[PDB]
PDB file of C-alpha atoms and ligand atoms in Angstrom:
ATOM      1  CA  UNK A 283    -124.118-198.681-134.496  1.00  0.00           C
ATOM      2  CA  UNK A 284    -120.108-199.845-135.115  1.00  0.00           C
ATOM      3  CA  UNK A 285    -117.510-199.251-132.756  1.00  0.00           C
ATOM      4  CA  UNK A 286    -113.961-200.242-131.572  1.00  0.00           C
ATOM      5  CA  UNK A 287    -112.186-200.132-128.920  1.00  0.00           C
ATOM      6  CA  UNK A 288    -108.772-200.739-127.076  1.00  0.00           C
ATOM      7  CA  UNK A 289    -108.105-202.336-124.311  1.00  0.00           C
ATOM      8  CA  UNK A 290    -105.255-202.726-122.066  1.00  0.00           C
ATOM      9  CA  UNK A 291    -104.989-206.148-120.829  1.00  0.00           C
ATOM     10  CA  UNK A 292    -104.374-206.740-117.245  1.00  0.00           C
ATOM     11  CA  UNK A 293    -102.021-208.937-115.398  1.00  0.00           C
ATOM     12  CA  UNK A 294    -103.493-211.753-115.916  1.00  0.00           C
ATOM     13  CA  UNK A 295    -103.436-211.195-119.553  1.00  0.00           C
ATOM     14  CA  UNK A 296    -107.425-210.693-119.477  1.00  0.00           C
ATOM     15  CA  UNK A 297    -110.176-207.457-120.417  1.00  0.00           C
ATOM     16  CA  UNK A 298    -112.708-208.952-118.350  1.00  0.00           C
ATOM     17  CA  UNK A 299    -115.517-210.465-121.075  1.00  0.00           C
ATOM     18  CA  UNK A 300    -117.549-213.297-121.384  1.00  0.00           C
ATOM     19  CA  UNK A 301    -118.812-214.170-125.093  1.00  0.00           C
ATOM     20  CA  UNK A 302    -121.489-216.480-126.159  1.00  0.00           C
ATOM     21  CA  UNK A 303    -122.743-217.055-129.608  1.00  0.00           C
ATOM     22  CA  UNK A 304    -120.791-218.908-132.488  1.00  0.00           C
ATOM     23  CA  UNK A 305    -122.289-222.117-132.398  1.00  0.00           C
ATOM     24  CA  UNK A 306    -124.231-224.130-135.634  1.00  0.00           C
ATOM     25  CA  UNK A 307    -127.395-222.036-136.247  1.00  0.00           C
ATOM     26  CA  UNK A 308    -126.126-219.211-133.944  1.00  0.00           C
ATOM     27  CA  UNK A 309    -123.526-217.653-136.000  1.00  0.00           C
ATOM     28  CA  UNK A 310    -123.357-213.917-134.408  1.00  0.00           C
ATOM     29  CA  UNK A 311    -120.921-213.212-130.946  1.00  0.00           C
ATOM     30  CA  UNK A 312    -122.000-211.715-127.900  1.00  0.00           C
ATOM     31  CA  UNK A 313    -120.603-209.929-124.655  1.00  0.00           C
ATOM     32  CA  UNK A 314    -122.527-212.170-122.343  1.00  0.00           C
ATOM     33  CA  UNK A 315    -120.726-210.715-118.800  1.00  0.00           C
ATOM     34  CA  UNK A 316    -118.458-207.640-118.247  1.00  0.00           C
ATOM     35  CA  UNK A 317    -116.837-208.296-115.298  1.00  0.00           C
ATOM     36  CA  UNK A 318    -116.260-205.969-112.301  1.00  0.00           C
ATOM     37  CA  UNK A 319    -112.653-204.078-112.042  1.00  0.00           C
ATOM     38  CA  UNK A 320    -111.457-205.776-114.930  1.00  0.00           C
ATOM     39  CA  UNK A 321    -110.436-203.296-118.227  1.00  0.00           C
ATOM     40  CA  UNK A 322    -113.593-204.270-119.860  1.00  0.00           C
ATOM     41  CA  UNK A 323    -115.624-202.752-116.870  1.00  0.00           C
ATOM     42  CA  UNK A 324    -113.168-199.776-116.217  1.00  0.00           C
ATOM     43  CA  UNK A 325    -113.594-198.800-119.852  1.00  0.00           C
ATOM     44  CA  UNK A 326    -117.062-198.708-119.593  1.00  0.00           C
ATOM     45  CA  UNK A 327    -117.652-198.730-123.792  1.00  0.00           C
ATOM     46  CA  UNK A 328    -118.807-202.460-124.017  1.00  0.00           C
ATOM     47  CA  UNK A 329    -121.862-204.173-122.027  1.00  0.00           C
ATOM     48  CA  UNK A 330    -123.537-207.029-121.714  1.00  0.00           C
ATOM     49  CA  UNK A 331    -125.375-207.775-125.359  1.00  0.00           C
ATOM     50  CA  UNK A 332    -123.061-205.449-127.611  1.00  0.00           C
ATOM     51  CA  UNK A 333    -122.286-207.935-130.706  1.00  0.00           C
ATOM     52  CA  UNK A 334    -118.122-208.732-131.285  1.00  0.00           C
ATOM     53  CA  UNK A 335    -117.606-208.614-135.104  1.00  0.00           C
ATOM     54  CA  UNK A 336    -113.711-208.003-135.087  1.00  0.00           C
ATOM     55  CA  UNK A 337    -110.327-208.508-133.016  1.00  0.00           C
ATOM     56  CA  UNK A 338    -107.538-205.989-133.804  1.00  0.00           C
ATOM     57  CA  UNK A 339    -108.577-205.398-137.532  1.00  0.00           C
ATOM     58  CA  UNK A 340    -109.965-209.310-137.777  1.00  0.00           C
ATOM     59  CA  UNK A 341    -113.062-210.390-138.722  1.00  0.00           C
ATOM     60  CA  UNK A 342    -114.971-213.123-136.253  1.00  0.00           C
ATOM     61  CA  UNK A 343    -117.118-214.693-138.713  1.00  0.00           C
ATOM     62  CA  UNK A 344    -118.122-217.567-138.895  1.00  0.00           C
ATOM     63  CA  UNK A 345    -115.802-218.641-135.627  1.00  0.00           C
ATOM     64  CA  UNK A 346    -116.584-220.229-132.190  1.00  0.00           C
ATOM     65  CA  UNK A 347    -115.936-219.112-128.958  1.00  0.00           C
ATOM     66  CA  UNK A 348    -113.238-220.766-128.021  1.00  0.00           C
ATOM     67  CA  UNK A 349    -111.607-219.568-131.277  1.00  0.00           C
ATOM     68  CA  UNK A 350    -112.559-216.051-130.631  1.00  0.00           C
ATOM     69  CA  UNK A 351    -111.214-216.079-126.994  1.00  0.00           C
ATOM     70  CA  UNK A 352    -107.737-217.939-128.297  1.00  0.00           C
ATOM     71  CA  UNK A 353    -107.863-214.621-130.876  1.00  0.00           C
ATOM     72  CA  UNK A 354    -108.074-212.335-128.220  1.00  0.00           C
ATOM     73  CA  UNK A 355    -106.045-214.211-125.180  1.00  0.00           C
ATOM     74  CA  UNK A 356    -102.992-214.473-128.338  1.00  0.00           C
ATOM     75  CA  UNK A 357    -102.865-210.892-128.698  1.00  0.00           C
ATOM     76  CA  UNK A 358    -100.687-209.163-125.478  1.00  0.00           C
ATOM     77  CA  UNK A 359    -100.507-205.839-124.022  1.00  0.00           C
ATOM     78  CA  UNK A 360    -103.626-204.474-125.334  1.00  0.00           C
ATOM     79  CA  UNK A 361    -106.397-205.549-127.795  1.00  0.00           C
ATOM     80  CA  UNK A 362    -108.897-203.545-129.924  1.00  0.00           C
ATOM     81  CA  UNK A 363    -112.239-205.386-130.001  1.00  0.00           C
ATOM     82  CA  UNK A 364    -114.609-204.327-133.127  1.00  0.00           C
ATOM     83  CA  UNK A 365    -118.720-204.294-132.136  1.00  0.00           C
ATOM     84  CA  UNK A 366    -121.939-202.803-132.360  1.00  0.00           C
ATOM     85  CA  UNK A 367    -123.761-201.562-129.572  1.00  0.00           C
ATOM     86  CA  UNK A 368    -127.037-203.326-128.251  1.00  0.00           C
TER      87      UNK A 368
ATOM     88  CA  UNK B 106    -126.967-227.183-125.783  1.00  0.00           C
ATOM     89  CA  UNK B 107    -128.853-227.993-122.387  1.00  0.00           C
ATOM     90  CA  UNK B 108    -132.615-226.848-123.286  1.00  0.00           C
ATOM     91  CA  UNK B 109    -134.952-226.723-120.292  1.00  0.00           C
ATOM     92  CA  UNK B 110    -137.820-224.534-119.597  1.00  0.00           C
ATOM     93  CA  UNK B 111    -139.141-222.546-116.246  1.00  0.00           C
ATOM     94  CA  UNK B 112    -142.491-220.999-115.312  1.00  0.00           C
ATOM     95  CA  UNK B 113    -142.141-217.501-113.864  1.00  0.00           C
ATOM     96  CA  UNK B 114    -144.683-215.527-112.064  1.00  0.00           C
ATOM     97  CA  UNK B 115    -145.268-212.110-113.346  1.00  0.00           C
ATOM     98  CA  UNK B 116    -144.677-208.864-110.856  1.00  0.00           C
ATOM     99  CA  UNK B 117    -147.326-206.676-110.779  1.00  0.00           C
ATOM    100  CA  UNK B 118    -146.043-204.531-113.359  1.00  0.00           C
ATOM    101  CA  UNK B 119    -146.734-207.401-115.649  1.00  0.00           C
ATOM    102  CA  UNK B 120    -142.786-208.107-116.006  1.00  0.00           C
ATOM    103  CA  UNK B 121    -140.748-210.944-115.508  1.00  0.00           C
ATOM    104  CA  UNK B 122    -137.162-209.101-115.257  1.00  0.00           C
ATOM    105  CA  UNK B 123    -135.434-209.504-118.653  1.00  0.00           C
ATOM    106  CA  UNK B 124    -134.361-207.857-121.680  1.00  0.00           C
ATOM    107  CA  UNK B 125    -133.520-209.787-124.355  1.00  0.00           C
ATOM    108  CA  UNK B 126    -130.728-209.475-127.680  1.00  0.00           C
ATOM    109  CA  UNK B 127    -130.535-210.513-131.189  1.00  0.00           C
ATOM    110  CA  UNK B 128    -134.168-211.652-133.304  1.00  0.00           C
ATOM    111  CA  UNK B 129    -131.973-209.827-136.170  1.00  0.00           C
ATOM    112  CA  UNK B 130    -131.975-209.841-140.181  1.00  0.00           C
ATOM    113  CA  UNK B 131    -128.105-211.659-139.727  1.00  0.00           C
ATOM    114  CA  UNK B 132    -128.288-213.196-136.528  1.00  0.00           C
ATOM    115  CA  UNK B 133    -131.616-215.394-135.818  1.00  0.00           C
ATOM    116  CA  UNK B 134    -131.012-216.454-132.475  1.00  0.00           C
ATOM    117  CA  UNK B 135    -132.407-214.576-129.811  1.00  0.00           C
ATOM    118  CA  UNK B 136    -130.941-214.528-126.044  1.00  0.00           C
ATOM    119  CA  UNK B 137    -131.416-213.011-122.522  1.00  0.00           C
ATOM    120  CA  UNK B 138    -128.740-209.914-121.765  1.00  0.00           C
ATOM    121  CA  UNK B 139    -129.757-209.116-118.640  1.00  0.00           C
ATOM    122  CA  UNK B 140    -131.900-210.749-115.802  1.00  0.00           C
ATOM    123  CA  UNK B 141    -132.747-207.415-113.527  1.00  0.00           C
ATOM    124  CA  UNK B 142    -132.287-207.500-109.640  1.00  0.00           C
ATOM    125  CA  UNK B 143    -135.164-208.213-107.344  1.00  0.00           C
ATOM    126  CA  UNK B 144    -137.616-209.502-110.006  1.00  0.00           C
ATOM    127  CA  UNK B 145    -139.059-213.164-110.942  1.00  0.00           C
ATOM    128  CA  UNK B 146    -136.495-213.971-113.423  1.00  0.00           C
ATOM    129  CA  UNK B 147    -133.784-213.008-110.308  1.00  0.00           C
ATOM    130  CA  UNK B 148    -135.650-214.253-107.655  1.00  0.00           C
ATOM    131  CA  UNK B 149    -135.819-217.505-109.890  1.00  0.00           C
ATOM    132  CA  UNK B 150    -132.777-218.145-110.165  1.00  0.00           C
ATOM    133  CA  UNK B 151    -132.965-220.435-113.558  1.00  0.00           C
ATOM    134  CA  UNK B 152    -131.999-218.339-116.499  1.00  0.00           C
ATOM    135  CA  UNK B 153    -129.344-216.016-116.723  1.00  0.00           C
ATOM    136  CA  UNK B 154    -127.429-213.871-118.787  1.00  0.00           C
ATOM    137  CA  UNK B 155    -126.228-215.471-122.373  1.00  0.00           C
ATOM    138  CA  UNK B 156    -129.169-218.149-122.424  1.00  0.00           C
ATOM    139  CA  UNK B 157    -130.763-218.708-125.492  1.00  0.00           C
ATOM    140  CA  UNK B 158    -134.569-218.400-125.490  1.00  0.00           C
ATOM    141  CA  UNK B 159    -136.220-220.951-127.827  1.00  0.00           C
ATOM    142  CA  UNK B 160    -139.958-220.456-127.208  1.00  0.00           C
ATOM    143  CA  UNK B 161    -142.918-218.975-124.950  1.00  0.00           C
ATOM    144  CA  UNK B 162    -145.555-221.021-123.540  1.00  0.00           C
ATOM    145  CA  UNK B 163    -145.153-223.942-126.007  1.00  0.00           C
ATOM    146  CA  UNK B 164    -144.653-221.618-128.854  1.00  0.00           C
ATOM    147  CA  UNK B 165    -141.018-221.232-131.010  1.00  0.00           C
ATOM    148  CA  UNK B 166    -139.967-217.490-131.558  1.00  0.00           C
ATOM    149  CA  UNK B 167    -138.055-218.729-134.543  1.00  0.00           C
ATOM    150  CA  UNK B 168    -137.514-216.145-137.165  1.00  0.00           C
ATOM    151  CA  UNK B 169    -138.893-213.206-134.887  1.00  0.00           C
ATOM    152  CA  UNK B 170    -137.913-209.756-133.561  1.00  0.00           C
ATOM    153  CA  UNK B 171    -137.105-208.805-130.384  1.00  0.00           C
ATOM    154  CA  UNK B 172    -139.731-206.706-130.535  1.00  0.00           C
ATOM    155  CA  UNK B 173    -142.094-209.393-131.083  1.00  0.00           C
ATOM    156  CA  UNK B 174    -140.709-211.646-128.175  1.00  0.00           C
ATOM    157  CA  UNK B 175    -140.937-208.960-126.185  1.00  0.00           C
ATOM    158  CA  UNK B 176    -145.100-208.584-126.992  1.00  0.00           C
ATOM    159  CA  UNK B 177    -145.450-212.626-127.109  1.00  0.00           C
ATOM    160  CA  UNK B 178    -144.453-212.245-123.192  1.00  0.00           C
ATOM    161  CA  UNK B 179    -146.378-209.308-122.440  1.00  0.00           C
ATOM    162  CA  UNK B 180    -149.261-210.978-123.745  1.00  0.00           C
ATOM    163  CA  UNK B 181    -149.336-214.013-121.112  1.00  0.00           C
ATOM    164  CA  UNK B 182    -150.624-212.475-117.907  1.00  0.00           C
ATOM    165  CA  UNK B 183    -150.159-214.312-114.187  1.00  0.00           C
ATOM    166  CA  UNK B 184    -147.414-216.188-115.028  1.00  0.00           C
ATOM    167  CA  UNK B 185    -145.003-217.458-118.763  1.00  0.00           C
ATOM    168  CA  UNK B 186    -142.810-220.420-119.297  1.00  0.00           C
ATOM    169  CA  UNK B 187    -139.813-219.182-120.674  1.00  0.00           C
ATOM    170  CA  UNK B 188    -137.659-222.417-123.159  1.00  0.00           C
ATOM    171  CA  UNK B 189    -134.049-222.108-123.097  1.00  0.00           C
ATOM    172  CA  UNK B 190    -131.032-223.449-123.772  1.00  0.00           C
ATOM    173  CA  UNK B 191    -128.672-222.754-121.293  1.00  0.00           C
ATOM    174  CA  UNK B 192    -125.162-220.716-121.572  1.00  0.00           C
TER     175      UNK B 192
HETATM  176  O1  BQA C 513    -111.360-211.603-120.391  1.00  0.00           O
HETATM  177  C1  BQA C 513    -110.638-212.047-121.451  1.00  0.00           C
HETATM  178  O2  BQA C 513    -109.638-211.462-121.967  1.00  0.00           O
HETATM  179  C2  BQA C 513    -111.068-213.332-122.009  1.00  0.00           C
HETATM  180  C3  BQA C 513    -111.729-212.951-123.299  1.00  0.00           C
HETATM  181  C4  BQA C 513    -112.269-214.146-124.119  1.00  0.00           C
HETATM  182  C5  BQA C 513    -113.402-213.737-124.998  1.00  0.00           C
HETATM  183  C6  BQA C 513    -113.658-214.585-123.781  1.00  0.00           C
HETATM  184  N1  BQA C 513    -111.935-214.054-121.131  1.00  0.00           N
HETATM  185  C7  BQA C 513    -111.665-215.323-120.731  1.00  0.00           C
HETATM  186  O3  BQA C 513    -110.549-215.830-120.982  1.00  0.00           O
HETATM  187  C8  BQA C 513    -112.735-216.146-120.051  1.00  0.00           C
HETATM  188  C9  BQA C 513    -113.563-216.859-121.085  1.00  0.00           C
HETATM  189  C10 BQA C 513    -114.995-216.725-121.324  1.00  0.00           C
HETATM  190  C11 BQA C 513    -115.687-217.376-122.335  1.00  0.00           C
HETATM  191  C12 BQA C 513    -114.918-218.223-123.092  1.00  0.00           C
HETATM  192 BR1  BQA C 513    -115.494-219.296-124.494  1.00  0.00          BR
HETATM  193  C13 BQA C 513    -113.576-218.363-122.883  1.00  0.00           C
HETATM  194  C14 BQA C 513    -112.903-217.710-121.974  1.00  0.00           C
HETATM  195  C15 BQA C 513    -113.702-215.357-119.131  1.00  0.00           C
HETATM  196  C16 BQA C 513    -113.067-214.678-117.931  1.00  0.00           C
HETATM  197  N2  BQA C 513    -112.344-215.709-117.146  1.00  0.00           N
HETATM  198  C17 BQA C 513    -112.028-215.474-115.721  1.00  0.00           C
HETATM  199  C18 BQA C 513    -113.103-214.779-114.885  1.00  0.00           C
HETATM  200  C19 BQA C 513    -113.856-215.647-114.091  1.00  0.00           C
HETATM  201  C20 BQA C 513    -114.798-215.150-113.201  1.00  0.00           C
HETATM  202  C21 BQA C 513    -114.861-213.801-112.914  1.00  0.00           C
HETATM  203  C22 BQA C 513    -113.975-212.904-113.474  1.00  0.00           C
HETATM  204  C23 BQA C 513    -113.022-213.338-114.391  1.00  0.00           C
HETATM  205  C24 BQA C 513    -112.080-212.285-114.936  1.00  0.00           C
HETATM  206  F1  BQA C 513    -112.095-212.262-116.273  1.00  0.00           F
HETATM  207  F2  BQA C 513    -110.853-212.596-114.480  1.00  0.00           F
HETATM  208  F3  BQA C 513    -112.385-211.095-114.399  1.00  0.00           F
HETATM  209  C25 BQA C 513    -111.458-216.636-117.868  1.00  0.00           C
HETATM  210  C26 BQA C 513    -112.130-217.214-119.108  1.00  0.00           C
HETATM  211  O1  BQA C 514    -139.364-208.190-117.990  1.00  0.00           O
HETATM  212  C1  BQA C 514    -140.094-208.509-118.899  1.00  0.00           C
HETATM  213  O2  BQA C 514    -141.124-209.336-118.640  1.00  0.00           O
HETATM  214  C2  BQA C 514    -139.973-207.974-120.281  1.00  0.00           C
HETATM  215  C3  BQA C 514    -139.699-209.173-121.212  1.00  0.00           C
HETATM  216  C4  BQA C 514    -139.414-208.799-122.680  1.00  0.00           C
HETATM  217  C5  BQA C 514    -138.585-209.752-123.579  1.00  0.00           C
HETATM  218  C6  BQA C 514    -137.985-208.438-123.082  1.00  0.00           C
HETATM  219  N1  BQA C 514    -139.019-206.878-120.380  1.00  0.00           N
HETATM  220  C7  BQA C 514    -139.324-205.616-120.766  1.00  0.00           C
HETATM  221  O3  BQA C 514    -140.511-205.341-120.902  1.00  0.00           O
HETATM  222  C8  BQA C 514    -138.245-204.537-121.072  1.00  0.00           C
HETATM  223  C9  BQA C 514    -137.771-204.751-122.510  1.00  0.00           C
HETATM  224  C10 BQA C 514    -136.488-205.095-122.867  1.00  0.00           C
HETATM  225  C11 BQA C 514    -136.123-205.437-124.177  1.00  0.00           C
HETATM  226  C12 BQA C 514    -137.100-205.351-125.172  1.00  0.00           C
HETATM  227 BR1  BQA C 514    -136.844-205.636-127.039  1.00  0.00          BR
HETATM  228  C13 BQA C 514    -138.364-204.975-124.835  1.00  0.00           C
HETATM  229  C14 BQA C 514    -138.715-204.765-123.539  1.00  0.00           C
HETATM  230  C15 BQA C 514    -137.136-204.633-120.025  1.00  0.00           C
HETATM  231  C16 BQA C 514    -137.613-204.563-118.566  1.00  0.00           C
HETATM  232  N2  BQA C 514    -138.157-203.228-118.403  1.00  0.00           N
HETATM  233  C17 BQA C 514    -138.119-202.590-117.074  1.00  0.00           C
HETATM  234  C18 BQA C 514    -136.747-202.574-116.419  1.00  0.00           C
HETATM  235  C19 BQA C 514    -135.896-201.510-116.744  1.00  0.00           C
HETATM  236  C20 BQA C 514    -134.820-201.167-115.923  1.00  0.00           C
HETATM  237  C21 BQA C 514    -134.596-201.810-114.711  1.00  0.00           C
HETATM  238  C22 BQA C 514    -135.445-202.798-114.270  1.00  0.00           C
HETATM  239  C23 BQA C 514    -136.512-203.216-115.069  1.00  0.00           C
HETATM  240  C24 BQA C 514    -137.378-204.318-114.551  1.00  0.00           C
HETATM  241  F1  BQA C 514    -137.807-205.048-115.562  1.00  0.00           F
HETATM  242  F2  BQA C 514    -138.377-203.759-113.869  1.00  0.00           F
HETATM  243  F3  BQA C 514    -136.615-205.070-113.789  1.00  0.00           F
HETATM  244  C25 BQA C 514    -139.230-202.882-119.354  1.00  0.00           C
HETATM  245  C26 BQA C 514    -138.824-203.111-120.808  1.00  0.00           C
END
């Protein structure tokens, strides 16, 4: 099941998500950790084990974490992350 | 990628506190999602959230479902060793 949603960053310039994933072999992208009172959390859409295919109309594929969180950390204000649900 | 492996006892309920992500027709690689409070896995402390699994009791889980992990562990009573590769 596909989904999107926006987020509005916080002060810190963060939603409050860990990803894992990305790596040689291991191609798809994970929420690993929502954190607590962080926009991710707040939101409540996105958990632990949805799959991240997209960042503000991007596609994530074939990219590694550190590339995905540089995509996401880049865009200010708020950012629309693309999944499907777990 | 740190692999390692732990033994956990299961609770009486035949569980080891776990579900478990991926195993799918685009991505192979199969992980932990969530390690539930107050169960082996928890009590444990070893694996956690975003760990790849690699293998149950000496056996790879390469190229199955979740839904197949999830019988391959149901099957072992007592206790499972759980191979990982840590987050
Ligand atoms: O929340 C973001 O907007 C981003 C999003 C990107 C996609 C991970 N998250 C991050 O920057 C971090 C990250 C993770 C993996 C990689 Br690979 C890279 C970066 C994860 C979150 N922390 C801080 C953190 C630490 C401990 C508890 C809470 C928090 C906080 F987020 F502040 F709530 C900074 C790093
Ligand atoms: O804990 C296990 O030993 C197993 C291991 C298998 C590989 C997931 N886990 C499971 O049986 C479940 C599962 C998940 C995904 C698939 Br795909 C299939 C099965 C997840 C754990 N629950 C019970 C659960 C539910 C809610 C709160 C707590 C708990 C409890 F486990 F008691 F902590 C039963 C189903």
């Amino acid at each position: 099941v596909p989904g999107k949603v926006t987020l509005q960053k916080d002060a810190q310039n963060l939603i409050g998500i860990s990803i894992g994933g990305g790596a040689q072999y291991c191609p798809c992208l994970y929420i690993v950790q929502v954190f607590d009172n962080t926009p991710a959390a707040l939101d409540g859409t996105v958990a632990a084990g949805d799959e991240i295919t997209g960042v503000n109309g991007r596609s994530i594929k074939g990219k590694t974490k550190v590339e995905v969180a540089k995509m996401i950390q880049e865009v200010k204000g708020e950012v629309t992350i693309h999944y499907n649900k777990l």
